Amino acid sequence: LIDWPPFEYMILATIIANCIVLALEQHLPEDDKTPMSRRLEKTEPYFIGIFCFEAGIKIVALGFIFHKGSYLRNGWNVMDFIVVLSGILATAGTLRTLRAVRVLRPLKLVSGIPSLQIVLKSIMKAMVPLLQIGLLLFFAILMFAIIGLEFYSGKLHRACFMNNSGILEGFDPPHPCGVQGCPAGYECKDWIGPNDGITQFDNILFAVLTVFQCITMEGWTTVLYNTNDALGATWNWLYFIPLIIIGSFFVLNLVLGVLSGEFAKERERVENRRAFMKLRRQQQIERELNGYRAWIDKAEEVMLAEEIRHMVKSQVFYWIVLSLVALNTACVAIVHHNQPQWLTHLLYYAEFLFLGLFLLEMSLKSSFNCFDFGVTVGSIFEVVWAIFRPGTSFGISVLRALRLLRIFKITKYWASLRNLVVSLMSSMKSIISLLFLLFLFIVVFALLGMQLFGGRFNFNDGTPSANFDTFPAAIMTVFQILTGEDWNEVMYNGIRSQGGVSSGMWSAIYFIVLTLFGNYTLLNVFLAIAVDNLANAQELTKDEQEEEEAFNQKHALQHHMSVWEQRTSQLRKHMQMIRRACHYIVNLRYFEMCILLVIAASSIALAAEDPVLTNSERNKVLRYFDYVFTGVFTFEMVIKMIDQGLILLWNILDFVVVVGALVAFALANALRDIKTIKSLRVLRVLRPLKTIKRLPKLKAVFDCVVTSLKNVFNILIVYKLFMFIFAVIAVQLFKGKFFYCTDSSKDTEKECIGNYVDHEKNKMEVKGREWKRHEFHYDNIIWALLTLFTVSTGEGWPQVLQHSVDVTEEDRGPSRSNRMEMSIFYVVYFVVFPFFFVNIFVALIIITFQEQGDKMMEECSLEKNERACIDFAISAKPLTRYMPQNRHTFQYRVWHFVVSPSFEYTIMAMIALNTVVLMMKYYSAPCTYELALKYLNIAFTMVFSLECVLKVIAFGFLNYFRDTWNIFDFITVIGSITEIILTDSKLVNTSGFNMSFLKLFRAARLIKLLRQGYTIRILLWTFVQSFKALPYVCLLIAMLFFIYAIIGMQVFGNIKLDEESHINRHNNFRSFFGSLMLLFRSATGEAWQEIMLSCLGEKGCEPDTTAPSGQNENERCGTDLAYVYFVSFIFFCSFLMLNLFVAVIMDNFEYLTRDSSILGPHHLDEFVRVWAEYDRAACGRIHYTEMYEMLTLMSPPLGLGKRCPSKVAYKRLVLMNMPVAEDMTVHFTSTLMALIRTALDIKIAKGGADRQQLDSELQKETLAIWPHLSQKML
């Protein structure tokens, strides 16, 4: 059957049918079957027989034994054979090898369509460079887990329980006990664990799982608070804050940098260049053809005039039909719940009027029409459908608001947007294939989850909304886990369904793999799409706006590039191969400095303040300091106004700060309405912002941030328009439907009145009936926008999805899982905004990042990366490893046992065994086991101690310290010796201060094996080195954190701490550090919307101990300005984070795009080690014997590739200005610069006649480098 014209199509149809059958299965607990599932069970033998037939046709009629082109030698066919063979065994039992393996059946579509094979191959190829990053992740997870094992092991097993109510009860977020006891009539008692004994550091596996959950920023604050009340809140913050900073933010930065570098490198491949050239020529032909079409119409209009639809090409008509769209846009954006009765009638007539008018507009007739026709026909279908079945109206006329994007034509930003759309439309098959492949993998994971946890989530308190029972529910749960929101809560259910923490922990692997390969594969795919489609648009725009300049300069006849642009252009060309004394007093040298000190002092004073106790000694002294601060601030500016003459800028905020402070005690000391005083005193939080103008580097980074915002604003407009469209559609879907009664029995507001018995937590209670609304809803467009923003941030969106699914009708209480098709809206929203637009913003910031340090046009004008390499030649001192000089019986004899391969390998084995021992501890270990662990540490610390004292014998006491790593080893071993001495000696002990930190010195031996990792070490060092080159972006982020913390403390600092809310003893604005921790928690996005709601409205106020008054409560505190305060913080911080990451990525863009074929900075180490090894001591001289054999042993990618080009290579040495005129001259730097010129920027060999101008250019380009280069040239 070697000819299969449609055989493959029929097999594909069979696979599709099998996928559909697998999608209709429903899983029930305790061996229960739906009658539909029993019928579906009958279809399996047919599929098994068909697949057996197709396998037999390819085994014995294509080849199985002949190894060349056999059936099983293909990787994509062994999977098919495994699936068919395991399916056969399932019918032989008439379960893991029987039914749990048929979830790979959808993966047979990938092998069926080789296009999907190519797409998957590209996906995998793009993800290879991330592997090393993954290694750097695992070590980090290994590093902190061990630290968590030595401190938190077994410390989370007691909790406050005693309530004289049945040896039970306690707070819903249970309060673990510690070294201080319960605060009240509670007593410490044995506790299973925080998440039913799952979130803990008992052994290394639990610690690793907890650390992995924390680095994903999912519930890490709960872990932090569990150890805050179990061991005190003094040092726990020192473990979790770095863990998020290193494990989560740093890894994300590294992943983004590596991915962007790989995308830039791979955009210059031959096939990609050919495709882009094809697209460019298509666009150029279209551009030239469009202009000629104007001639045909203009001529045709004239002849008919001198012997038709000329009004539809005029500005007036194009503006009227665009203002009518704007009028329609506002018409649909005013619909809201409980709208006035006349407004409904007016809008009902307006929709008909607008539909008729737009039909009339169409009657008088790019793809503008191709989209307008679709919008209008959809509107007709929607209005016709609504009339036949009244009650529901999704709303599609709002899609015609997309025509408002045509207003960009009058601007100068139309070319870039049109190019972006053109590039996206050209590369649409690839995008569709990528989305389909992601859908296929999601389907496979949903089926696997249905097998593992299907029909197992109905516990005693009810089944969760995120279950794997039906296919829609399983796919929703898998999507939620992929987005990484509340995945730990699903993992907890998946563990306690397989047998609890005892024997169900193996089910965590599913969620770990899903989280990893959804967090990073999704980012890879979508960032690749965004980068490859935005760089193409940038190149098209630059080639379209530069061919008109050249043409215009020819019509008369007859380097602000970003780092990305420069690097990508260079990568391509290298691939083919009275006012008299006031002026004096303000112009003093030591004047601005004292202003900085006073501003910093005022900021620190703002930091130290109690918002609850208004009238205290500290607050009084702080106000007294504020008096002199505002006096000096008035004095700093009155001398400038009588100097610069007021207005004949940036210091407007300084003026408002100075003025508002005077009014602050003008009204306070005027003598009722004390609230205006507090509201006016929040102004002084702009005091830190006064340092931006004074510091020039801070001003530079602020200007860079502003320019980035200006660059992104154009796409921000489109993002806002799409968000508005979605919000308008979301209103028509869930307007007024987010209401519920406190008891599930009642459905409307009429019944929801009175009292009812509540049977929660196995306890009865009489509670009033309240007709409440969900906290986040879609009642109007502002609430819809806020809800969609919170969903886009990714916080609490599963709860909003559940509320939307429970939606039933206009004014009725929810019905569980009533409308499950409402999850289409959220899936589409997630695919569009957080998956595509955010990556568009990131890519646009990446590819349009202007260099900040240089800010110069012609720094070298020939290259950019070799400037460091050019200056590296004079800085490449042969730093030796300090070999012994004595060569005697004492120093040398022991030295041969240091460089010997027995010693180093033995030390590596000892390090590996020590790391194995470190993770061998667990809670409730036998006493003999702990004793063995203790004595094992003693053995290892002697070997490392002996190694430390054996190095100093050979290298030298003042010589062994010359290396950073040897200092680290000495400090580690000294700390370990101190630790073992202090806690083992019978009489040398302590009873007071706790020296428990010394355990870190024992756990800091992991970094030793970091010496083995070469590329990991280089990458880490490069990123760390480029982190300290920009110490003012971090300063800007710190300033934003400080300002927002001060604002929150001054505004939300007096809210009463209440449990069951998110402003409690753990999370509040009471102190500066508490507010800073709250802001960090919100930045990581834990429950920031819950905090925003809990600091919103008329919350009860903290009792003020001081300031006596004649009332009891006066007024409630807590503003309604919380919304802005959080919505502005989630944006700003995020932006300020992104502008940081790119600032680190573009600083190392030379490393991230290495192109290891003509590498020059990475090759310097090889030449350095060769020169060091050949001459034991440099002595400032080079012999005339080893040069002629240098190119042979030196790496092939430079100098010498083979014997055929060896003649050319040698001709690149002779017949020019040779240094061998004097045989005792320099022969290293000469051939180095010869190689550098030959490898890059060949400009002298071709000419070979003029050399003085090149020497002058080299001398003038390196004037301030201590110019001893007079002999380097020779």
Ligand X SMILES: CC(C)CCC[C@@H](C)[C@H]1CC[C@H]2[C@@H]3CC=C4C[C@@H](O)CC[C@]4(C)[C@H]3CC[C@]12C
Ligand Y SMILES: CCCCCCCCCCCCCCCCCC(=O)OC[C@H](COP(=O)(O)OCCN)OC(=O)CCCCCCCCCCCCCCCCC
- What are the residues binding ligand Y (CB under 6 A)? 139-140, 143, 147, 151, 179, 231-239, 241-242, 246, 994, 996-997, 1000, 1034, 1037-1038, 1041, 1073-1074, 1076-1077, 1080
Give the 3-state secondary structure of residue 974: helix
405 binds, options ligand PT5, ligand Y, ligand X, none, Cβ within 5 to 8 A by partner type:
ligand PT5
In angstroms, the CA 459 to CA 442 distance is 26
608 binds, options ligand X, ligand Y, ligand PT5, none, Cβ within 5 to 8 A by partner type:
ligand X
239 binds, options ligand PT5, ligand Y, ligand X, none, Cβ within 5 to 8 A by partner type:
ligand Y
Cβ of residue 1007: shortest distance to ligand Y, in angstroms? 7
Identity of the residue, 378 or 956, whose beta carbon is nearer to ligand X in the bound complex: 378
Cβ of residue 1231: shortest distance to ligand X, in angstroms? 50
594 binds, options ligand Y, ligand PT5, ligand X, none, Cβ within 5 to 8 A by partner type:
none
Structure tokens at 1185: 């014997």
Please state the three-class secondary structure of 1041-1068 as a single string.
HHHHHHHHHHHHCCECCCCCCCCCCCCC
In angstroms, the CA 294 to CA 297 distance is 5
For residues 160 and 177, is the Cβ–Cβ distance under 8 A?
yes
Q: Which 821-860 residues touch ligand PT5, going by CB under 6 A?
A: 831-832, 836
Q: Please provide the distance, in angstroms rounded to a whole number, between the alpha carbons at the two ends of the chain.
A: 75
At a CB cut-off of 8 Å and minimum separation 6, what does 781 contact?
333, 334, 336, 724, 727, 728, 731
Identity of the residue, 418 or 699, whose beta carbon is nearer to ligand PT5 in the bound complex: 418
Identity of the residue, 423 or 477, whose beta carbon is nearer to ligand X in the bound complex: 477
Cβ of residue 157: shortest distance to ligand Y, in angstroms? 14
Interface residue with ligand PT5 among 189, 418, 678, 1056 (CB under 6 A) is 418
668 binds, options ligand PT5, ligand Y, ligand X, none, Cβ within 5 to 8 A by partner type:
none
242 binds, options ligand Y, ligand X, ligand PT5, none, Cβ within 5 to 8 A by partner type:
ligand Y
Identity of the residue, 55 or 508, whose beta carbon is nearer to ligand X in the bound complex: 508
Cβ of residue 420: shortest distance to ligand PT5, in angstroms? 5
1186 is in an annotated binding site: yes
Give the 3-state secondary structure of residue 1274: coil
Nearest to 1274 by CA among 1243, 1251, 1249: 1251
Cβ of residue 852: shortest distance to ligand Y, in angstroms? 19
Total Cβ atoms within 10 A of residue 401: 21
Structure tokens at 353: 């009027």
For residues 1158 and 576, is the Cβ–Cβ distance under 8 A?
no
In angstroms, the CA 680 to CA 660 distance is 7
Identity of the residue, 373 or 890, whose beta carbon is nearer to ligand PT5 in the bound complex: 373
In angstroms, the CA 665 to CA 669 distance is 5
418 binds, options ligand PT5, ligand X, ligand Y, none, Cβ within 5 to 8 A by partner type:
ligand PT5
In angstroms, the CA 283 to CA 540 distance is 8
Identity of the residue, 182 or 514, whose beta carbon is nearer to ligand X in the bound complex: 514
Give the 3-state secondary structure of residue 767: strand
In angstroms, the CA 467 to CA 493 distance is 9
Cβ of residue 636: shortest distance to ligand Y, in angstroms? 28
1175 is in an annotated binding site: yes
Signed CA dihedral, 299, 305, 309, 310: sign only: positive
600 binds, options ligand Y, ligand PT5, ligand X, none, Cβ within 5 to 8 A by partner type:
none
Buried b (16+ CB within 10 A) or exposed e, 570-583: beeeeeeeeeeebe
Nearest to 702 by CA among 692, 690, 710: 692
Cβ of residue 686: shortest distance to ligand Y, in angstroms? 19
Cβ of residue 721: shortest distance to ligand X, in angstroms? 9
92 binds, options ligand X, ligand Y, ligand PT5, none, Cβ within 5 to 8 A by partner type:
none
Element (H or E) spanning 506, and its range? none
Identity of the residue, 736 or 1074, whose beta carbon is nearer to ligand Y in the bound complex: 1074
1181 is in an annotated binding site: yes
Interface residue with ligand PT5 among 94, 366, 1112, 1156 (CB under 6 A) is 366
Nearest to 1229 by CA among 1271, 1201, 1169, 1184: 1271
Cβ of residue 848: shortest distance to ligand PT5, in angstroms? 16
Interface residue with ligand PT5 among 117, 282, 290, 978 (CB under 6 A) is 290
Count the helix, strand and coil residues of the chain and give each as a percent rounded to the nearest 5.
65, 0, 35
Contact characters 398-417, ligand PT5, x per CB under 6 A: ----x--x--x--------x
Buried b (16+ CB within 10 A) or exposed e, 705-719: beebeebbebbebbb
In angstroms, the CA 22 to CA 450 distance is 10
Identity of the residue, 698 or 1037, whose beta carbon is nearer to ligand Y in the bound complex: 1037
Identity of the residue, 367 or 558, whose beta carbon is nearer to ligand PT5 in the bound complex: 367
Structure tokens at 1133: 């911080």
Cβ of residue 210: shortest distance to ligand PT5, in angstroms? 35
Identity of the residue, 354 or 1126, whose beta carbon is nearer to ligand Y in the bound complex: 1126
Start-end of H helices in 1095-1121: none
Identity of the residue, 237 or 436, whose beta carbon is nearer to ligand PT5 in the bound complex: 436
In angstroms, the CA 726 to CA 711 distance is 25
For residues 989 and 108, is the Cβ–Cβ distance under 8 A?
no
For residues 682 and 1047, is the Cβ–Cβ distance under 8 A?
yes
Identity of the residue, 527 or 1046, whose beta carbon is nearer to ligand PT5 in the bound complex: 527
Cβ of residue 400: shortest distance to ligand PT5, in angstroms? 12
Cβ of residue 1055: shortest distance to ligand Y, in angstroms? 16
Nearest to 1019 by CA among 139, 32, 52, 12: 139
Number of H helices and number of E strands within the chain? 52, 6
286 binds ligand PT5 (CB under 6 A): yes
Interface residue with ligand PT5 among 113, 407, 637, 718 (CB under 6 A) is 718
Cβ of residue 426: shortest distance to ligand PT5, in angstroms? 9
442 binds, options ligand X, ligand PT5, ligand Y, none, Cβ within 5 to 8 A by partner type:
ligand X
712 binds, options ligand PT5, ligand Y, ligand X, none, Cβ within 5 to 8 A by partner type:
none
What is the DSSP track for 1206-1220?
HHHHHHTTSSSS-GG
971 binds, options ligand PT5, ligand Y, ligand X, none, Cβ within 5 to 8 A by partner type:
none
Binding positions for ligand X, rule: CB under 6 A: 203-205, 394, 439, 442, 472, 475, 479, 601, 604-605, 608, 617-618, 621, 625, 722, 725-726, 729, 820-825, 827-828, 913, 916-917, 919-920, 922, 926, 928-929, 932, 936
In angstroms, the CA 1071 to CA 611 distance is 8
Nearest to 111 by CA among 204, 12, 44: 12
Identity of the residue, 365 or 1017, whose beta carbon is nearer to ligand PT5 in the bound complex: 365
For residues 684 and 657, is the Cβ–Cβ distance under 8 A?
yes
Cβ of residue 203: shortest distance to ligand X, in angstroms? 4
What is the DSSP track for 444-457?
HHHHHHHHHHTT--
Identity of the residue, 442 or 843, whose beta carbon is nearer to ligand X in the bound complex: 442
Interface residue with ligand PT5 among 371, 825, 892, 968 (CB under 6 A) is 371
Q: Residues annotated as binding site? A: 1175, 1181, 1186
Q: Residues annotated as binding site for Ca(2+)? A: 1175, 1181, 1186
- Residue numbers at the binding site for ligand PT5 (CB under 6 A): 286-287, 290, 366-367, 371, 402, 405, 408, 417-418, 420-422, 424-425, 431, 718, 831-832, 836
